[PDB]
Amino acid sequence: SGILASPGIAFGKALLLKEDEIVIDRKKISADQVDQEVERFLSGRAKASAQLETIKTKAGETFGEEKEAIFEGHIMLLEDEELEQEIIALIKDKHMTADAAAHEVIEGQASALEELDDEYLKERAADVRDIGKRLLRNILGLKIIDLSAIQDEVILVAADLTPSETAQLNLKKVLGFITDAGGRTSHTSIMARSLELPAIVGTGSVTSQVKNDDYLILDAVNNQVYVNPTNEVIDKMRAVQEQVASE
Amino acid sequence: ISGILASPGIAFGKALLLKEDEIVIDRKKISADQVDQEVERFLSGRAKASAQLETIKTKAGETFGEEKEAIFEGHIMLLEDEELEQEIIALIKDKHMTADAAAHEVIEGQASALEELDDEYLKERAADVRDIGKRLLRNILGLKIIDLSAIQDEVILVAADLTPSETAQLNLKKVLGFITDAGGRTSHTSIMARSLELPAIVGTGSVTSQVKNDDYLILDAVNNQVYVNPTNEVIDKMRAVQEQVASE
Numbered sequence: 001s002g003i004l005a006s007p008g009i010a011f012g013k014a015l016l017l018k019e020d021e022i023v024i025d026r027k028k029i030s031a032d033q034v035d036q037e038v039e040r041f042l043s044g045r046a047k048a049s050a051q052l053e054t055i056k057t058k059a060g061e062t063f064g065e066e067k068e069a070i071f072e073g074h075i076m077l078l079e080d081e082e083l084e085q086e087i088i089a090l091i092k093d094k095h096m097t098a099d100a101a102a103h104e105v106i107e108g109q110a111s112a113l114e115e116l117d118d119e120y121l122k123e124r125a126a127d128v129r130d131i132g133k134r135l136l137r138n139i140l141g142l143k144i145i146d147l148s149a150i151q152d153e154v155i156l157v158a159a160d161l162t163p164s165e166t167a168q169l170n171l172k173k174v175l176g177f178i179t180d181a182g183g184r185t186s187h188t189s190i191m192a193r194s195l196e197l198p199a200i201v202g203t204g205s206v207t208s209q210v211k212n213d214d215y216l217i218l219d220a221v222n223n224q225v226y227v228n229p230t231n232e233v234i235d236k237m238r239a240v241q242e243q244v245a246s247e
Numbered sequence: 248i249s250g251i252l253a254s255p256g257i258a259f260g261k262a263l264l265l266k267e268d269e270i271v272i273d274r275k276k277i278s279a280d281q282v283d284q285e286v287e288r289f290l291s292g293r294a295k296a297s298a299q300l301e302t303i304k305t306k307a308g309e310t311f312g313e314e315k316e317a318i319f320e321g322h323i324m325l326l327e328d329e330e331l332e333q334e335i336i337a338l339i340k341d342k343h344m345t346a347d348a349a350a351h352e353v354i355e356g357q358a359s360a361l362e363e364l365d366d367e368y369l370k371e372r373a374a375d376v377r378d379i380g381k382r383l384l385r386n387i388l389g390l391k392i393i394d395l396s397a398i399q400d401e402v403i404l405v406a407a408d409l410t411p412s413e414t415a416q417l418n419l420k421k422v423l424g425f426i427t428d429a430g431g432r433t434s435h436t437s438i439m440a441r442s443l444e445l446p447a448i449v450g451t452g453s454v455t456s457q458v459k460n461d462d463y464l465i466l467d468a469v470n471n472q473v474y475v476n477p478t479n480e481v482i483d484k485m486r487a488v489q490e491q492v493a494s495e
Contacts, residue, residue, distance in 0.1 A: 004470045007255075184489065193495075222252045222450075223471040241432070247441075 002223040003181075003202030005189030009219055009242050010155050010175035010198050011234070014227075016212040017158035020142045022133065024103050028095040037091050041098035044139030049079055051134070051144065052164075058148070059167035070127075070163055078131050083109070099139045106132030130162045150174070155218055159207050161188045171195065176218045178206045178225060200225060248457070248473030250426065250448025253437030256468045257490050258403050258424035258446050259482075264460040265406035265413075268390045270381065273345040285339045289346035292387030296326055299382065299392060300412075306396065307415035315415060322412070326379050331357065347387050354380035378410055398422070403466055405458050409436040419443060424466050426454045426473060448473055 029037060056071035077083070083105055090101035110128035113121045137144055150170035159180045161169075166187065176198035183189050183201030192199035198220035206225060210216065216227045217237050221244060226233060277285060300323050308316030325331070331353050338349040354376060361373040385392055395413055401421045408429040414436070424446035427436050431449035440447035446468035448454075457475055458464065465474045465485050469492055474481055 002470065222250070244432075 001203050001206075002200035002220075002225070003183045004199075004220060004223050005181075005183050005186070005201045006176070006192035006195075006197060006199035007220050008176060008196070008198030009217060009221060009237055009244075011217050011237070011242075012153050012155050012175045012215065014157040014178075014210050014212065014214050014216055015150075015152070015154040016207070016210060017145075017156070018212075019145070019159075020137065022136055022140065022142065024100045024136065025097040026100055027097065029091075029097055031095070034092055034095070037098040037101075038088055040139055041087060041091070041102060044098065044135055045078060045084075048131075048134045048138045049075060051138075051146070052078065052131075055164055055167050059163070062167065062171065067163070067167065071167075074127065074131050074164070077109075077128065078135060099136050102135055102139065103132065106135070127163065130164050134164070155216060157206055157210050160186070161191070163187060166191050171197075176220065177201070178210075178218060179203060180205050180207055248426070248448060248454055248471075248475075249451050250454075250468075250471055250473070251431035251450030252447070252468060252471050253431050253434070253449045254424070254440035254445060254447035254468060256424060256444070256446025256466075257485060257492070258466040258468070259486065259490075260401060260403040260423045260463065260465075262405045262426075262458050262460065262462040262464050263398065263402040264455065264458060265393070265404065265409075266460075267407065268385060270384050270388065270390070272348050272351055272384070274348055275345065276343045277339070277345055278343070282340055282343070285346040285349075286336055289335060289339070289350060289387060292346065292350075292389075293326065293332075293383060295386040295392075296379070296383045297323060299386070300326065300379075303412055303416050310419065311415060315411075318411070319415070322375070322379050325376065326383060347384055350383055350387060351380065354383065375411065378412055382412065403464060405454055406436075407455055408434065409439070411435055414439050424468065425449070426451055426458070426466060428453050428455055 052071065052075050056068055056075070059071055060068035086105045087098070087102045090096045090104060091098060096104070106128060110125040110132065113125040113128065145165070147165060147168040148170055150173045153173045153175050155176050155178060156169070156174045157178045161177065161179060174197065177188050177192055179188055179201050180203050181188055181201035186201060188199055188201055198218050200218060200220055200223060210227055214227055216225060217229060217234065218225055219237070219241070221241055300319060304316050304319035304323065307319055335349050335353050338344045338352055339346060342349070344352065358373040358376040358380065361369045361376065382392070394416065396416045396418055398418050398421050401423050403423050404425045406425070406427045408427045409425060422445060425436055425440055426448050428451050429436055429449045431437055434449060437447055437449050446466055448466060448468055448471060454473065462476055465477055465482065467474065467485060467489065469489060
């Protein structure tokens with residue numbers, strides 16, 4: 001399918017992003033527990049802040065100060081003295097688990113910027129949620145992504161990508177992006193065009209039509225994604241289309 | 248609509264379809280008295296072709312510069328060849344073949360000779376020879392020869408494939424892009440489009456089956472699509488939205 005965010009072709013295996021779904025616990029805790037969860041939260045926020053602190057820098061050296069400062073405000077929101085008061089209260093006051101309480105707050109903050117049909121405000125609620133997902137994972141002891149982990153040059157396949165993701169992404173080993181996105185103006189599109197790396201974004205669900213490690217070639221010229229082709233289809237793009245650089 | 252996206256861009260316009268007046272050769276054997284009208288029928292027929300080629304020659308010049316106009320004197324030297332001429336007249340006099348079928352035997356045979364070597368350039372000359380062949384046969388057959396100089400309105404050129412003799416007489420200020428049933432990424436249609444910075448979805452199977460003449464359509468050469476008679480919503484979805492690639 002496709003919307004065509006960025007021109008180019010690519011040959012490589014697909015790395016399929018898997019994001020551990022998040023089960024928030026609703027069960028009201030006992031007064032006994034109250035302390036433990038306040039610790040769960042403070043401990044979780046302690047790490048999520050730490051991961052955020054290395055991304056700031058990796059967004060920094062790669063993309064510079066414009067980007068390093070998107071990050072300063074990510075941290076500043078996660079560690080907001082008032083939002084802490086709110087999450088903790090729900091623990092002491094309404095006996096909610098840390099993972100359920102923090103969600104309520106962040107969710108209340110992201111969903112309050114979405115009231116306006118403002119593009120940028122909708123972009124903020126997006127990032128406000130990016131930060132909230134993080135925290136819950138850590139609180140939840142669920143496993144964290146970290147894209148610097150890259151071993152192979154791969155064609156990053158995912159549903160969508162956010163600034164926390166594309167910063168730690170090992171640029172000189174990702175051969176393009178394929179997402180279920182929205183695109184043409186989304187962060188993956190503007191991430192690619194700039195990088196001159198290919199990108200088809202408005203996909204319905206490549207995330208279901210591809211599996212991890214499947215070899216494939218992203219067309220991004222005529223807008224086609226070829227999953228596990230025959231060597232002649234390979235032989236085709238291989239240079240037939242791939243040699244669009246000569247002209 | 249498919250296409251092999253030879254030329255990025257987006258166009259908004261009425262589709263100008265290029266219906267080719269069908270060429271139907273006469274394989275009947277004339278008698279020894281009809282022999283002389285045919286030499287005439289060929290000769291007059293050939294004169295039109297030259298009249299038309301020397302005008303294209305010039306148009307190609309003023310516009311596409313000297314490289315291309317020089318390419319036309321080549322079409323004229325072929326067409327007005329004294330031996331091909333002598334070989335066509337003889338098939339009429341000795342073999343009693345119609346002016347048209349005769350002309351076709353000689354030129355085609357001349358083209359075929361070039362295609363025996365899988366050589367991209369030779370295969371190119373062979374087409375170019377079949378180009379002149381078609382022009383000579385229509386003119387012999389007294390058929391309609393299209394003057395694309397004659398385009399008055401801005402439009403999206405919808406065709407089977409576009410020939411050098413065709414695009415040279417093209418009023419470039421009014422062609423808004425091209426969609427053909429073509430080959431693509433290297434076809435003349437494609438190289439042409441790529442220079443002028445005119446969009447092109449060229450590998451279509453048959454855009455000449457869904458697209459009728461005078462269909463307002465938008466050619467999404469950003470995302471490989473062709474919208475036939477788009478709803479006012481789909482229009483603004485590109486008209487502004489997708490169309491504003493130019494800004495970025």
